Design a protein around this ligand. Structure first.
Ligand SMILES: Nc1ncnc2c1ncn2[C@@H]1O[C@H](CSCC[C@H](N)C(=O)O)[C@@H](O)[C@H]1O
Ligand SMILES: Nc1ncnc2c1ncn2[C@@H]1O[C@H](CSCC[C@H](N)C(=O)O)[C@@H](O)[C@H]1O
Ligand SMILES: [Mg+2]
Ligand SMILES: [Mg+2]
Lengths: 234, 234
């Protein structure tokens, strides 16, 4: 095989991870999220799926902050998207962006059976051109409450420069995979696929920059593969 | 302090923990939190201290849900309490409960230097009598937004029955240490102090109970020693 992090976890044992999933995540997972997850595990890019325990953490965060208008960048088969759509109120609206709609069509039957497709506006495109177009037309009355960032890893810093202007003051920007299977912990790290090493270097730089960015407050959370919550200050 | 699990981590390496703390927590840690942490690191019961990365997570939750009135059960030297106090607005209010005010007075100078002691009503007593008294005098206008539970482990379930009546609908109840150094992951775990084993068993039952409790939605988060976020439904 070609990728060198796919079998790693940030937790010390797989048994602890399975405990969390079986005890607290799966019993609270919507039946369509379960169906979407199980077909995605068979897909060749299963490594990139947002896990069930992180998903319930995203749902909890969305409800506690009373989010209504959100943006999802990096959809894949739609697990975190369906998680968002189920957590928002019935009049919630999501802008969902991904370069590859074929992945989205794997999840769309489960989103449709859940009855939340009406909340979703899917845009098949590279993320940055869509974001830049939003900056041209965005009214302050239409800023987003919440952004989940999970698309091209090397492009997170570029995403951030747009998203600090597209989410409201007090809104949240979440960066997925910021611990990169634990490989960010070292300046040098051996044997990775070039794409994996670029992403690793990008995340070490992002984590540093985000801790120094006065436009936001942060909390890096050791759930899933690392999630960094940012809250816009001004 | 002849406990066995004290130095065990749930992350796969001390280096990964140190990276998080050094890159993302310590740069964002208030000067008075640093000083309070450093004294408590030297205290006999350092094991029970809420870590700095978890503290920023608690703070982020409080700010995202716009908490105004909270309850803190289990203060110790006051790290999570100072975190809560700095997160709330100028007119925020906290009821803090601990059996041991001696601990509280270790951190009280840092709390005062932070300019936030006016938010805190410390009560030296066992939690359950206070919560029961609060129940007999509580008005629906005065329900809490947020509750952090971090006191005697074997009594969490008892606290839960009171707190689901004392926080507002949509309010948050957070249980600390719900993975208990990871030892909750197995039916049996050898080499533990008898009080450690009682806490471990108490958490396994509590984790099962909270996942089946229809009065709340939950999310268990592999941060620190595990934190379970509950949100009151009805
Ligand atoms: N430049 C880009 N712009 C938009 N999407 C991109 C992109 N580069 C990669 N992607 C998409 O980003 C996704 C990352 S996997 C995302 C996982 C998803 N959030 C979940 O819940 O499981 C892939 O589907 C990929 O197609
Ligand atoms: N029955 C009880 N009622 C109230 N507090 C109790 C209690 N039993 C133990 N405690 C207190 O619970 C605390 C647990 S340590 C708490 C750590 C603290 N939240 C932090 O930020 O680091 C101890 O201070 C202990 O004194
Ligand atoms: Mg991801
Ligand atoms: Mg604790």
């Amino acid at each position: 095989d070609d990728y060198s992090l796919v079998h790693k976890n940030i937790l010390h044992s797989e048994d602890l991870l399975k405990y969390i999933l079986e005890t607290s995540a799966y019993p609270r997972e919507h039946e369509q999220l379960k169906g979407l997850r199980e077909v995605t595990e068979k897909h060749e890019w299963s490594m990139a799926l947002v896990p069930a325990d992180e998903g319930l953490f995203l749902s909890m965060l969305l409800k506690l902050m009373n989010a209504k208008r959100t943006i999802e960048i990096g959809v894949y088969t739609g697990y975190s998207l369906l998680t968002t759509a189920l957590a928002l109120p019935e009049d919630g609206k999501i802008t969902a962006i991904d370069v590859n709609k074929s992945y989205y069509e794997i999840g769309l039957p489960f989103i449709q059976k859940a009855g939340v497709e009406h909340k979703i506006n899917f845009i098949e495109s590279e993320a940055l051109p869509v974001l830049d177009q939003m900056l041209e037309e965005m009214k302050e009355e239409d800023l987003y409450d919440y952004a989940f960032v999970d698309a091209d890893k090397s492009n997170y810093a570029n995403y951030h420069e747009r998203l600090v202007k597209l989410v409201r003051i007090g809104g949240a920007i979440l960066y997925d995979n910021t611990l990169w299977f634990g490989s960010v912990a070292y300046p040098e790290y051996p044997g990775l696929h070039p794409e994996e090493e670029v992403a690793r270097l990008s995340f070490r730089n992002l984590n540093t920059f985000l801790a120094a960015d006065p436009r936001v407050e942060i909390s890096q959370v050791s759930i899933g593969d690392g999630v960094t919550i940012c809250r816009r200050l001004y």
